[PDB]
Design a protein around this ligand. Sequence first.
Ligand SMILES: CC(C)(C(=O)NCCSc1ccccc1C(F)(F)F)P(=O)(c1ccc(C(F)(F)F)cn1)c1ccc(C(F)(F)F)cn1
Ligand SMILES: CC(C)(C(=O)NCCSc1ccccc1C(F)(F)F)P(=O)(c1ccc(C(F)(F)F)cn1)c1ccc(C(F)(F)F)cn1
Ligand SMILES: CC(C)(C(=O)NCCSc1ccccc1C(F)(F)F)P(=O)(c1ccc(C(F)(F)F)cn1)c1ccc(C(F)(F)F)cn1
Ligand SMILES: CC(C)(C(=O)NCCSc1ccccc1C(F)(F)F)P(=O)(c1ccc(C(F)(F)F)cn1)c1ccc(C(F)(F)F)cn1
Ligand SMILES: CC(C)(C(=O)NCCSc1ccccc1C(F)(F)F)P(=O)(c1ccc(C(F)(F)F)cn1)c1ccc(C(F)(F)F)cn1
Ligand SMILES: CC(C)(C(=O)NCCSc1ccccc1C(F)(F)F)P(=O)(c1ccc(C(F)(F)F)cn1)c1ccc(C(F)(F)F)cn1
Ligand SMILES: CC(C)(C(=O)NCCSc1ccccc1C(F)(F)F)P(=O)(c1ccc(C(F)(F)F)cn1)c1ccc(C(F)(F)F)cn1
Ligand SMILES: CC(C)(C(=O)NCCSc1ccccc1C(F)(F)F)P(=O)(c1ccc(C(F)(F)F)cn1)c1ccc(C(F)(F)F)cn1
Lengths: 191, 193, 181, 194, 193, 190, 190, 193, 194
Amino acid sequence: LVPTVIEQSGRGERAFDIYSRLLKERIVFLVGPVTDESANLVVAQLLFLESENPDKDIFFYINSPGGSVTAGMSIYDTMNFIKPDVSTLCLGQAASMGAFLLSAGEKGKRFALPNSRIMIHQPLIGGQASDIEIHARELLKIKEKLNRLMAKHCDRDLADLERDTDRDNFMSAEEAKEYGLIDQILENRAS
Amino acid sequence: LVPTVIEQSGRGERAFDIYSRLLKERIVFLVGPVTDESANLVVAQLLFLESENPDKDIFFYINSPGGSVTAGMSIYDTMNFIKPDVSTLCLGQAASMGAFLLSAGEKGKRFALPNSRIMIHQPLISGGQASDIEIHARELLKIKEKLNRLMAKHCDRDLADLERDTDRDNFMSAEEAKEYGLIDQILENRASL
Amino acid sequence: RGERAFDIYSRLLKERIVFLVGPVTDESANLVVAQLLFLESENPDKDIFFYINSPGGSVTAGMSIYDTMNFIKPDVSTLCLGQAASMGAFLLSAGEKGKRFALPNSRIMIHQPLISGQASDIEIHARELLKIKEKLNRLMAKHCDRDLADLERDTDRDNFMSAEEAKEYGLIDQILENRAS
Amino acid sequence: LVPTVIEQSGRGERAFDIYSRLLKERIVFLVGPVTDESANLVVAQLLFLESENPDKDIFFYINSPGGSVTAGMSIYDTMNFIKPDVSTLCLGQAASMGAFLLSAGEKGKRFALPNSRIMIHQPLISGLGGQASDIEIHARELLKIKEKLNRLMAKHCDRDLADLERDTDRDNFMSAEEAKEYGLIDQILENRAS
Amino acid sequence: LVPTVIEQSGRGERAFDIYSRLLKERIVFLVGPVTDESANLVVAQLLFLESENPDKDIFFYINSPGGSVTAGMSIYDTMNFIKPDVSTLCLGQAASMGAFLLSAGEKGKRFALPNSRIMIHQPLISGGQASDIEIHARELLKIKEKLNRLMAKHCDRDLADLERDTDRDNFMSAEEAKEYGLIDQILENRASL
Amino acid sequence: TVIEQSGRGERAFDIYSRLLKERIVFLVGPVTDESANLVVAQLLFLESENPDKDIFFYINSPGGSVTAGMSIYDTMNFIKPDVSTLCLGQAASMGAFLLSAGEKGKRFALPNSRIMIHQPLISGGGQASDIEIHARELLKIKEKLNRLMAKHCDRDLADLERDTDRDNFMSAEEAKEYGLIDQILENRAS
Amino acid sequence: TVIEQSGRGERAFDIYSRLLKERIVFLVGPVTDESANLVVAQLLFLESENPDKDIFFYINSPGGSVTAGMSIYDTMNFIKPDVSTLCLGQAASMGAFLLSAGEKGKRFALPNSRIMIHQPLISGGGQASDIEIHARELLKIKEKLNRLMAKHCDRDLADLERDTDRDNFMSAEEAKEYGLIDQILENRAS
Amino acid sequence: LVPTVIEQSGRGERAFDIYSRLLKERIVFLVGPVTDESANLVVAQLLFLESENPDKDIFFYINSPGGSVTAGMSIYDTMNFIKPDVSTLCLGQAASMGAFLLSAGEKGKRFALPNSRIMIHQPLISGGQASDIEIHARELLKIKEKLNRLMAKHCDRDLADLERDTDRDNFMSAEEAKEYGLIDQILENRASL
Amino acid sequence: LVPTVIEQSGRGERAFDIYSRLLKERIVFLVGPVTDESANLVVAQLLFLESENPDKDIFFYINSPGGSVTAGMSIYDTMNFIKPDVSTLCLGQAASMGAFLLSAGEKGKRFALPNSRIMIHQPLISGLGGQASDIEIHARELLKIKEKLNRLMAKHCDRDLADLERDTDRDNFMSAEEAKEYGLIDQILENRAS
Ligand SMILES: CC(C)(C(=O)NCCSc1ccccc1C(F)(F)F)P(=O)(c1ccc(C(F)(F)F)cn1)c1ccc(C(F)(F)F)cn1
Ligand SMILES: CC(C)(C(=O)NCCSc1ccccc1C(F)(F)F)P(=O)(c1ccc(C(F)(F)F)cn1)c1ccc(C(F)(F)F)cn1
Ligand SMILES: CC(C)(C(=O)NCCSc1ccccc1C(F)(F)F)P(=O)(c1ccc(C(F)(F)F)cn1)c1ccc(C(F)(F)F)cn1
Ligand SMILES: CC(C)(C(=O)NCCSc1ccccc1C(F)(F)F)P(=O)(c1ccc(C(F)(F)F)cn1)c1ccc(C(F)(F)F)cn1
Ligand SMILES: CC(C)(C(=O)NCCSc1ccccc1C(F)(F)F)P(=O)(c1ccc(C(F)(F)F)cn1)c1ccc(C(F)(F)F)cn1
Ligand SMILES: CC(C)(C(=O)NCCSc1ccccc1C(F)(F)F)P(=O)(c1ccc(C(F)(F)F)cn1)c1ccc(C(F)(F)F)cn1
Ligand SMILES: CC(C)(C(=O)NCCSc1ccccc1C(F)(F)F)P(=O)(c1ccc(C(F)(F)F)cn1)c1ccc(C(F)(F)F)cn1
Ligand SMILES: CC(C)(C(=O)NCCSc1ccccc1C(F)(F)F)P(=O)(c1ccc(C(F)(F)F)cn1)c1ccc(C(F)(F)F)cn1
């Protein structure tokens, strides 16, 4: 991957890779599987944007199939912690932890482009039976928490999310807006 | 891959790699399979040239066999969203999603070089419980129809046409693509156009 | 005989005992069928004892055994030892009603079909899969004297049953302990 | 593994592979891991000996580290279902399911050799997979299996279910004496003079 | 991994990668499994920050499932040695050696975000003569005791509590970790923080 | 064990079944559950044909599974017949243990046999609790082995503990002096 | 060693080059020809900038190549500057050897450091002549190591021969008592 | 390998595989590398032949490149123990432990075919602590000496000749092997034989 | 392998990777196996330092187990061709071709550190292939190479060709003292006070 290099200005024309250039406009990308490294990269940029300007919105572009719940949560908690409104934008796809982060942007500022693919579902995955029990119970707790938090993000009842996440649930952008998972569908420079 | 490094002038004088220099003239490449990384890098480039001048045409060069529909859609929506005209130029080939994005350039500004190759076809895959197999089957049906209608839109044809002409691989010459409505012009050389 | 099994298994075939052990393949399923045909040939009236210890396997291989059980004249008594799951449970439930048995600590499990190109081909195969799912549910409901609706409900996900719960469900008739007719 | 061949004479001299000779004396072996295949070969031999004579003892030699639970239960129920007493005898080791089967022999006729090794422990799984609903189903099922085994073991040893819960929580090695003691086996054989 | 690049002003405009820019403000990360080199990288960052200012707190963000205990002990001892208080912050998860380090922060400055996951448990080894194995078992016993004791003090609990509660994987919410004495406060947002 | 050849007596036998007909039993190569139980089966069968006739047990083994070895050992001791043991090529580790286990006075080696003894040796477990459990068990096994071999050799336990701390190679003479075997064979001249 | 971060001083440095500017040198992970020679290069460079200022050498290593270790060792001894040694996490085998090699009085450990010493240990050669050659060489190395560590610890050679026959784990206190290190650090309060 | 089957007559017609039929006439083969099981198979054949007739010679055909020395010592000691003289015949080759066994035949009845190849050399090992390696080197030295001594007697030469001449691979023709004292006679055909 | 970076100040402060800093002091390193690539990097550094100053000593640190013969000869001839003296210094180990290069330094300036390891031995090949005519060609060639090396080594050590033939027949380990003794190196350095 050679990222193209770009020139700015503001007394002294500086060069930087195109993603650092887009960081200056407060755009952060979640592309691909959510890992500790990729999620912490997102945290790092969210903290930096907050200290650059705690009053300006941050635009979080999500094109992700999901991944680590724990790494997803670290992105989650950072979005909610910092002063800026984290506005989310689905591009290409937002599934699993991807959809959870997308739906976690500031209400009123969660967007999808028209042909986005959103998907939600319950969690997905040795030792002695004691260790199996412990991990099974923990996994039930994660599912229950993910459903409660997503019921809240979508302004829906818990019962609705248990049912609609029992198996893979694909939604068009329109079906996502309808569900409460996003607010607006972006088509082109107009809104 | 060593990208040759190159020089530019104009009260000041800097040196980028050849792709960053070409990006300065608003040329963007899609080469090989569209993955998440390669699609998002096209998106980043589109967002940038818009910001740099939301009114100048962008020149989207495509040489691709396709790849992820989801990564490719993220290019399509960006292309449509941003203000400037995304002109498309097929060189080498545009197959599956590559042809889809080719057909998605601003009508009147979709081009091919004289020996480009275009190909279009229905989606093809490479699961577990019967309930889950069924959810993913109905979803692959929806994607197939969606892709057909979006292709009918770009091509000014019926959905029935694209249903028929994508049921199996459908190769097109540059002339055949233009007649299909997939592209607009066939650039031969500099002199003419 | 012998037939890639043992002399012990040949001796027990003489006492009309047929084993299904392990996964159901084309190979292991046809050997059951072959034994079944053979035993009907040696006496089309005496019962066959079909011992099942299997997590299941290929549905079409299973159906070959099922249709052979139903076609031959002798009543095929089924007996679960160890486990009978998926296609294995299906075959167990398919024994002659009144002669479907289980040892006290057998594991029984039933569920919907589990699986391993072009969208057109996916559509064709997905539809065949649903027809499969429905046919097994109907047949299993008939085996169990229950409502099609109950089977669809109780096989959405893996459903483990002890011997007692299989008896109650309608999947077997008797739990065998020692010697008590 | 070539098995040696052997003559039984008198009113007709016949030849057997040695293990077939030992089956004729109602001796059955479980050796190595318990799989569906090797367990069902035990079941089949138990059925044959009952068929030949439903009243004589059967002697079940066990040298095994354990293996499949369902496969082992198929031996277990077959032991209890058939009329003959199945005497069990540990040589080398009776581990996990192998010790479950050793302790399942007819009370009074569960034996070990002086330097046998016995070990009991709760179930262990290799690994997991699907959705949380499925992982809940399999965990709930595995906990049922763990109680079934503890409860059966307790009966065999004449102990509280709690006793076997505690003493299987981790690997639990026993000498032959410690196993007699625990109620796993009845007698420790030293030689034939006994 | 492409770390984004960032510019700061003040008597001179300079460029940093984002993690160096965050280091500039006394923030250090332990992300992923604890290895010798990832551990020593944390140590070097603490040595540097103490030299820049031995009296300002250091903010130690932890998102890790654990790792080598010796490597984790190099961080631990470096945290206790340096004059600056090391505040610990759990984001994502802090498990095993990551839980240890999280709890090892300066009492009063150990936090977790609301959905952090903490887990603690006994050592756990992956992969000669009985004499050799005897020696290593004895050593492992000593390590297991020492980790329990150190963590008992971190938690202001008895040793026998930590031995009991680390026999198997012990998962905790942020709130359960606050009760146990493993963190001090849950951070919700810029509440009062 | 390519093709095992056949000989005649009045019936036909493979040569190993023939040697078994004369109460010769082989332990060759590593001691596995299956090779050890084949030795157990032969010993059980030989006892029943003649509970009083000696059994001759050839050992060419580098050893192997402790539990597998123990099963031959307890069988040797259990059965009425004396089990003579005869080392050719090598008896090392559990091989040497079984060689020493032969009926005392009837433990032999050939002049260039190689004998070797040592403490238990393991390849490469999980939680520390499990590690301590298995470590304690491995040491019980070490101590148990030293005590039986001390008893086989009529020697101090501390002697065998000192002499198996590391690999200890013994010639046939050395094993005789040690108490591990009784005589060294050569020729029929005996 | 993901991205090594940058700090400022008046120029920009990666953080390890920054620590080197203050005569701190790290040995981390296994001792290879390349990691050992990088330590050699740092030590040579530090001497030339100031032949009299102490050098501080952090050791978190499980050890590694003997010849690689020796090259750090002879360099430490050769150069004018005192090389202080500081163990964090672990110094085992050649790691512990180098820790002990620090200028006497200037060998430190952190309170939970783990130290470990033992005899030379080899994975797994050709003709017997070559085997005897390499076996004799391995023993010369064992003896040489025991004697230098005896000298580093001010102890009998026979002491170190007895105490490295098998893996010997030492706490920081134990290593101090043994003579392997001098002080145990904690706090700046020192 | 399909061993051909063969019938013999005499008070009764029976069928043997060819190697069993050749065993019937006191012929045993060592073909290929010497392993524990191929060695023990030779031992069992010698035990059987001595019992069939302890006074008729045994003909031991050897075509082997060597193998385990312990396994080869089981044959060696069995050959010296049994009353029948074991005549050795080298066909193809006899190398290392195969050379040893060839030379170990009863003096006067060790032969080679005209184009047999003999080779002798020092032991040669394929593939813990210095203490352990010390012990094993010492043992290997003792084995190398013992093999040299035994072979020196087989050859009626001094020990120091065999040590010298086995330092590296020492190839010999049948005739050179006859001179060295490793065989007695070269068989050409049914000359006088 | 991150190499640290370093400041050289005075009339302008510059930054180098440390190894580049050490090259400026005419220090060259051969570390690890001798391959065509790492040898030619040595040759290139020898050419550069002669270019910068053809009269100052060059100091060649060697920590290497050996490697390619032709690659090592490329260093050897370049050492002798260039005007500067190339002083050699063993640290860690100078084995096979590494000890050939150590002994090839300018007489008087071949040094070792107290605990260095030196070892010399005849060539060894990995492996063979073609027709017997080719195997004869390569064997005849390898024997030429073996004599070339022994003969050169003898010159370096002031010994008979026969001496080095004998003492390379099998692996031959030397302490630093034994190597000074043998004539491989001149002085054993202990510290800077010397
Ligand atoms: C760690 C803490 C210092 C921090 O990250 N500052 C932001 C550093 S970036 C920066 C700042 C200024 C100038 C330039 C830069 C940049 F970027 F250019 F380098 P903090 O502010 C914090 C904690 C948690 C999170 C979140 F979102 F991850 F959860 C977010 N921020 C903080 C403050 C107080 C406390 C107390 F007192 F409660 F302990 C704890 N933590
Ligand atoms: C996110 C949004 C700021 C954005 O992408 N800017 C990218 C322009 S970068 C830039 C800008 C100025 C100067 C320099 C630079 C550069 F390039 F050097 F960094 P936006 O303009 C947008 C949305 C979607 C897409 C597409 F095409 F991908 F879909 C494209 N652009 C936008 C505006 C308003 C809202 C509202 F109203 F919903 F909040 C939402 N989104
Ligand atoms: C897209 C088009 C601007 C283009 O790629 N320019 C690339 C040159 S960048 C440049 C320019 C000036 C100074 C510096 C630079 C640089 F590089 F240093 F920064 P175009 O010129 C074109 C099309 C096809 C091909 C070929 F050869 F690949 F086939 C080639 N060029 C073009 C496209 C369409 C039309 C139409 F259809 F509207 F007539 C007319 N022209
Ligand atoms: C094939 C068929 C002849 C058949 O199996 N014979 C076996 C008779 S054994 C026998 C008899 C005497 C002596 C020894 C033996 C033995 F066995 F010891 F050697 P069939 O009876 C049949 C079909 C399908 C199935 C099942 F179970 F798979 F469903 C079962 N049986 C049959 C009859 C008529 C037709 C018609 F009418 F269509 F022409 C078609 N098929
Ligand atoms: C080795 C010691 C010099 C050291 O690490 N300095 C590193 C500080 S970097 C620095 C400093 C100033 C300016 C710029 C920089 C920078 F950042 F730009 F490079 P020290 O301070 C030490 C030891 C251990 C630890 C810890 F945390 F690992 F435990 C921590 N520090 C020390 C002090 C006293 C003694 C005594 F008393 F025993 F002699 C020995 N060692
Ligand atoms: C089980 C017992 C019958 C048994 O295995 N015989 C095996 C010999 S087969 C045989 C027998 C006769 C004729 C032919 C054959 C053959 F070989 F041709 F088939 P047993 O004699 C016994 C126990 C333990 C061991 C040993 F060595 F493995 F430890 C050995 N033998 C025995 C006797 C009494 C009791 C009591 F009274 F305590 F219950 C229990 N066990
Ligand atoms: C070769 C010798 C010049 C050398 O390596 N200096 C390395 C220091 S580089 C340097 C120097 C000055 C300024 C800047 C730099 C730097 F770092 F920025 F580049 P030397 O000092 C030596 C030998 C051995 C070792 C050790 F520790 F590895 F064993 C160490 N140093 C030396 C001196 C005298 C003799 C004599 F007289 F006997 F020939 C031989 N060798
Ligand atoms: C063990 C001993 C019975 C033995 O091997 N018989 C095997 C001969 S098979 C046989 C025999 C007769 C009829 C039929 C058969 C056959 F073939 F059909 F089965 P033995 O004769 C012996 C020991 C060692 C070796 C050798 F060559 F390996 F060294 C060789 N033979 C023996 C003799 C004396 C003593 C004493 F004196 F110490 F008690 C101990 N052992």
